Write a protein that holds these residues in place. Structure first.
Motif, PDB file in Angstrom:
ATOM      1  N   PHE A 142     -42.043  32.674  18.343  1.00  0.00           N
ATOM      2  CA  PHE A 142     -41.801  32.339  16.946  1.00  0.00           C
ATOM      3  C   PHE A 142     -41.472  30.858  16.808  1.00  0.00           C
ATOM      4  O   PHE A 142     -41.040  30.206  17.759  1.00  0.00           O
ATOM      5  CB  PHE A 142     -40.707  33.217  16.298  1.00  0.00           C
ATOM      6  N   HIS A 143     -41.716  30.333  15.607  1.00  0.00           N
ATOM      7  CA  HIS A 143     -41.497  28.928  15.283  1.00  0.00           C
ATOM      8  C   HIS A 143     -41.227  28.827  13.788  1.00  0.00           C
ATOM      9  O   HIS A 143     -41.330  29.816  13.053  1.00  0.00           O
ATOM     10  CB  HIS A 143     -42.707  28.063  15.660  1.00  0.00           C
ATOM     11  N   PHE A 144     -40.896  27.623  13.326  1.00  0.00           N
ATOM     12  CA  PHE A 144     -40.586  27.403  11.917  1.00  0.00           C
ATOM     13  C   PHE A 144     -41.415  26.249  11.372  1.00  0.00           C
ATOM     14  O   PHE A 144     -41.947  25.424  12.119  1.00  0.00           O
ATOM     15  CB  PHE A 144     -39.097  27.084  11.659  1.00  0.00           C
ATOM     16  N   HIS A 145     -41.495  26.207  10.042  1.00  0.00           N
ATOM     17  CA  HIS A 145     -41.970  25.072   9.258  1.00  0.00           C
ATOM     18  C   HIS A 145     -40.877  24.777   8.250  1.00  0.00           C
ATOM     19  O   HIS A 145     -40.323  25.713   7.676  1.00  0.00           O
ATOM     20  CB  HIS A 145     -43.277  25.421   8.532  1.00  0.00           C
ATOM     21  N   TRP A 146     -40.547  23.502   8.034  1.00  0.00           N
ATOM     22  CA  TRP A 146     -39.461  23.180   7.114  1.00  0.00           C
ATOM     23  C   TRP A 146     -39.744  21.846   6.448  1.00  0.00           C
ATOM     24  O   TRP A 146     -40.671  21.123   6.823  1.00  0.00           O
ATOM     25  CB  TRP A 146     -38.091  23.154   7.822  1.00  0.00           C
ATOM     26  N   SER A 185     -41.807  25.616   3.033  1.00  0.00           N
ATOM     27  CA  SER A 185     -42.593  26.789   3.384  1.00  0.00           C
ATOM     28  C   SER A 185     -44.076  26.470   3.291  1.00  0.00           C
ATOM     29  O   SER A 185     -44.504  25.506   2.639  1.00  0.00           O
ATOM     30  CB  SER A 185     -42.264  27.984   2.489  1.00  0.00           C
ATOM     31  N   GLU A 186     -44.866  27.266   4.006  1.00  0.00           N
ATOM     32  CA  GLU A 186     -46.310  27.101   3.968  1.00  0.00           C
ATOM     33  C   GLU A 186     -46.927  27.969   2.883  1.00  0.00           C
ATOM     34  O   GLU A 186     -47.671  27.470   2.034  1.00  0.00           O
ATOM     35  CB  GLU A 186     -46.925  27.424   5.331  1.00  0.00           C
ATOM     36  N   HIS A 187     -46.635  29.264   2.900  1.00  0.00           N
ATOM     37  CA  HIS A 187     -47.017  30.095   1.773  1.00  0.00           C
ATOM     38  C   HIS A 187     -46.095  29.804   0.608  1.00  0.00           C
ATOM     39  O   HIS A 187     -44.960  29.345   0.790  1.00  0.00           O
ATOM     40  CB  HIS A 187     -46.955  31.566   2.137  1.00  0.00           C
ATOM     41  N   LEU A 228     -54.888  30.348  11.566  1.00  0.00           N
ATOM     42  CA  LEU A 228     -53.790  29.501  12.019  1.00  0.00           C
ATOM     43  C   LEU A 228     -53.602  28.345  11.035  1.00  0.00           C
ATOM     44  O   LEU A 228     -54.562  27.874  10.415  1.00  0.00           O
ATOM     45  CB  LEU A 228     -54.097  28.954  13.417  1.00  0.00           C
ATOM     46  N   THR A 229     -52.356  27.877  10.878  1.00  0.00           N
ATOM     47  CA  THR A 229     -52.107  26.778   9.944  1.00  0.00           C
ATOM     48  C   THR A 229     -51.970  25.427  10.629  1.00  0.00           C
ATOM     49  O   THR A 229     -51.703  24.431   9.952  1.00  0.00           O
ATOM     50  CB  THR A 229     -50.859  27.039   9.091  1.00  0.00           C
ATOM     51  N   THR A 230     -52.145  25.352  11.939  1.00  0.00           N
ATOM     52  CA  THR A 230     -52.344  24.065  12.584  1.00  0.00           C
ATOM     53  C   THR A 230     -53.675  24.116  13.319  1.00  0.00           C
ATOM     54  O   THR A 230     -54.235  25.202  13.522  1.00  0.00           O
ATOM     55  CB  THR A 230     -51.222  23.712  13.580  1.00  0.00           C
ATOM     56  N   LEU A 254     -40.458  31.053   8.617  1.00  0.00           N
ATOM     57  CA  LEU A 254     -40.423  31.548   9.987  1.00  0.00           C
ATOM     58  C   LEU A 254     -41.695  32.330  10.274  1.00  0.00           C
ATOM     59  O   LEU A 254     -42.083  33.196   9.486  1.00  0.00           O
ATOM     60  CB  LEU A 254     -39.192  32.441  10.174  1.00  0.00           C
ATOM     61  N   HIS A 255     -42.356  32.015  11.392  1.00  0.00           N
ATOM     62  CA  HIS A 255     -43.584  32.690  11.799  1.00  0.00           C
ATOM     63  C   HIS A 255     -43.354  33.359  13.141  1.00  0.00           C
ATOM     64  O   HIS A 255     -43.035  32.682  14.123  1.00  0.00           O
ATOM     65  CB  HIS A 255     -44.758  31.707  11.898  1.00  0.00           C
ATOM     66  N   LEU A 256     -43.513  34.680  13.179  1.00  0.00           N
ATOM     67  CA  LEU A 256     -43.471  35.461  14.418  1.00  0.00           C
ATOM     68  C   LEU A 256     -44.913  35.798  14.812  1.00  0.00           C
ATOM     69  O   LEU A 256     -45.588  36.555  14.106  1.00  0.00           O
ATOM     70  CB  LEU A 256     -42.638  36.720  14.189  1.00  0.00           C
TER      71      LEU A 256
HETATM   72 ZN   LIG Z   1     -46.497  28.612  11.748  1.00  0.00          ZN
END
Ligand SMILES: [Zn+2]
Ligand SMILES: C[C@]12CCc3c(ccc4cc(OS(N)(=O)=O)ccc34)[C@H]1CC[C@@H]2OS(N)(=O)=O
Length: 257
Positions: free
Chosen positions: A90-94, A102-104, A194-196, A115-117
């Motif tokens: 898991f990782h985060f975007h902030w 958030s991404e969404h 994927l978002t990256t 948070l992405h699991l």
């Molecule tokens: Zn992510």
């Protein structure tokens, strides 16, 4: 290479990864009034009691906690999924401010973090094969709002000092990811990417309706991480989120009325 800056950020990624302009890119805005309730969707089944965390790592674009995925120890099933998906990391975007990160988004609302699991479909045998498949990965997305502290997050927050710069890693055993889940498992779901980079279109997205709260002191600790490696000019790791992409020919389904 790619990043989140003015000259290498998300608007540039298509030059190296042409699928950035593809048909099922993520993230997306979730329009709550045009999402369709689907009564054939199963409840999510999250079996994290046997999870084994291994390491925490600053990879230059985020930090991630990795898990032992050599057996069915921490798995996701049910919901829109067929088969068993093993938790990998898991990782985060902030964001740099509480109003973004958030991404969404939900009806264009941005949360302070997401948070992405990340889980992969065991029928493909290894995560490298799974990313080449339209149903290879399932990512569970959880929104973070700023308010009360989340006690289950504090162990992550306290170790970030030791992985400040790109490439640093540290042992991170016996972390229970169940401490990060909200009370409800109601969700939206849509097929995405994927978002990256490599932005592969291999993800079933499962986005939970209920956010978790974290304190301002917890999220401020995220914002003190560094994009740069040690000894380089200091660039704070903030705003590591991709903006919403066109929904195109896709329907978002909801597990709840
Ligand atoms: Zn992510
Ligand atoms: C390292 C890899 C490529 C990138 C990647 C991977 C896994 C989960 C990921 C989650 C991401 O973030 S997100 N917001 O959930 O979509 C972004 C990238 C991810 C692996 C899968 C095998 C690739 O390694 S490889 N190409 O075979 O050598």
């Amino acid at each position: 290479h790619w990043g989140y800056g003015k000259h290498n950020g998300p608007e540039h990624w298509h030059k190296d990864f042409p699928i950035a302009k593809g048909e099922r890119q993520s993230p997306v805005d979730i329009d709550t009034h045009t999402a369709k309730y689907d009564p054939s969707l199963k409840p999510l089944s999250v079996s994290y009691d046997q999870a084994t965390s291994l390491r925490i790592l600053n990879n230059g674009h985020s930090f991630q906690v990795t898990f032992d995925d050599s057996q069915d120890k921490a798995v996701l099933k049910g919901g829109p999924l067929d088969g068993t998906y093993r938790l990998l990391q898991f990782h985060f975007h902030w964001g740099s401010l509480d109003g973004q990160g958030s991404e969404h988004t939900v009806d264009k609302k941005k949360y302070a973090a997401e948070l992405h699991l990340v889980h992969w479909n065991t029928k493909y045998g290894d995560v490298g094969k799974a990313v080449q498949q339209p149903d290879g990965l399932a990512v569970l997305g959880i929104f973070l709002k700023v308010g009360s502290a989340k006690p289950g997050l504090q162990k992550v927050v306290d170790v970030l000092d030791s992985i400040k710069t790109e490439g640093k890693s540290a042992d991170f055993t016996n972390f229970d990811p169940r401490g990060l889940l909200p009370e409800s498992l109601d969700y939206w779901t849509y097929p995405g990417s994927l978002t990256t980079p490599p932005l592969a279109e291999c993800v079933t997205w499962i986005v939970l309706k209920e956010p978790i709260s974290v304190s301002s002191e917890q999220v401020l600790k995220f914002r003190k991480l560094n994009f740069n490696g040690e000894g380089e000019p200091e660039e704070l790791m903030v705003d590591n989120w991709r903006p919403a992409q066109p929904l195109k020919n896709r329907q978002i389904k909801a597990s709840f009325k």
